[PDB]
Structure 1
């Protein structure tokens, strides 16, 4: 059975852990427990192909930025998540992609850009300004909401199909 090594990066508080908890146990959490580096896994059939998802949740805080070089080396795909409310998360998401492209010298690496917190009815990041950044990176873009399960399956499923294209 094929296994996919997915990594979820982003800034602090963007809701990258609630996306994973909403995937495995379909539970939404409100208590912000900062994560250092936890790993999850759950199998599911995608495009008629049963597979395994090796999800690795990272830390959004700049405190544990030294551990970035490790999980950016073993990760097959990447799930760049930013907060729609936090404008800084959309700014320093550039520093994450260029750092991935440094450890992995290949410019085209499996990666999708995810816009979490879309359920919050106070949008700050333009809905269309992420596509031109996704087109400049050459990667898909999904708007997800950890509180209503909206698109959190498609965003993870799209990354699994994105890794298939990079071979």
Structure 2
């Protein structure tokens, strides 16, 4: 069966775990241990294709080791998640994108930019600013809310579609 290895990256607190648990369990977690990195599998049908999504929800200390490089390199596509009420998390997107390119040793890595927490009124990152960033990277931008589930399926399925495009090259 077709399988996709998806990796969810971004600053602490942006909603990586809540996005992952919504996709996998269809519920919103108000609290999920910030330090816990884990992986989950889900069988999905996307554009008629049955596949298994293996999703790594990243966490942990900031450390750079050969072992970490090697397991991040196994990801086939990456969600670059920031929160729309946290400018620093948007500023950190560049860093996560450069580290992914470093370990994949490629400029052409499937990615999707994800602006999460779209339900909150306190926005500090304008939608146009994030659309411009995604355009400069050549990747899709999706606004999500793990809380209301807006955009959650779209973010992950869009990443699968980006992987397919890559595999056709």
1:3 deviates by 0.2
Q: Deviations over 1:110-145 (max 9, x none)?
A: 111101011111111011001111011000000000
Q: Deviations over 1:82-122 (max 9, x none)?
A: 01111111111101111111111210111111010111111
- Separation of aligned partners in 2, 1:115 and 1:17: 14
Aligned to 1:146: 146
Higher mean C-alpha deviation, range 39-48 or range 101-110: 101-110
1:147 deviates by 0.4
Q: Deviations over 1:3-27 (max 9, x none)?
A: 0000000000001100010111111
Give the conservation status (yes or no) of the 8 Å contact 1:85–1:125.
Answer: yes
- Equivalenced residues, count: 167
Runs of at least 5 residues in structure 2 that lack an aligned partner in the other structure: none
Three-state SS of the structure 2 residue aligned to 1:63 is coil
- Separation of aligned partners in 1, 2:36 and 2:67: 9
Aligned to 2:64: 64
- Separation of aligned partners in 1, 2:117 and 2:49: 30
Q: Deviations over 1:19-63 (max 9, x none)?
A: 010111111111241133200011010001111001011016536
Higher mean C-alpha deviation, range 99-108 or range 3-12: 99-108
Distance of aligned partners of 1:88 and 1:65 in 2 relative to their CA distance in 1, 3 Å threshold = farther
Give the conservation status (yes or no) of the 8 Å contact 1:142–1:155.
Answer: yes
Three-state SS of the structure 1 residue aligned to 2:163 is helix
Relative to the length of structure 1, the TM-score reads: 0.94
Relative to the length of structure 2, the TM-score reads: 0.93
Runs of at least 5 residues in structure 1 that lack an aligned partner in the other structure: none
Higher mean C-alpha deviation, range 108-117 or range 34-43: 34-43
User: Which consecutive aligned stretches of 4+ in structure 1 deviate over 6 angstroms post-superposition?
Assistant: 63-67
Distance of aligned partners of 1:66 and 1:125 in 2 relative to their CA distance in 1, 3 Å threshold = farther
Higher mean C-alpha deviation, range 53-62 or range 74-83: 53-62
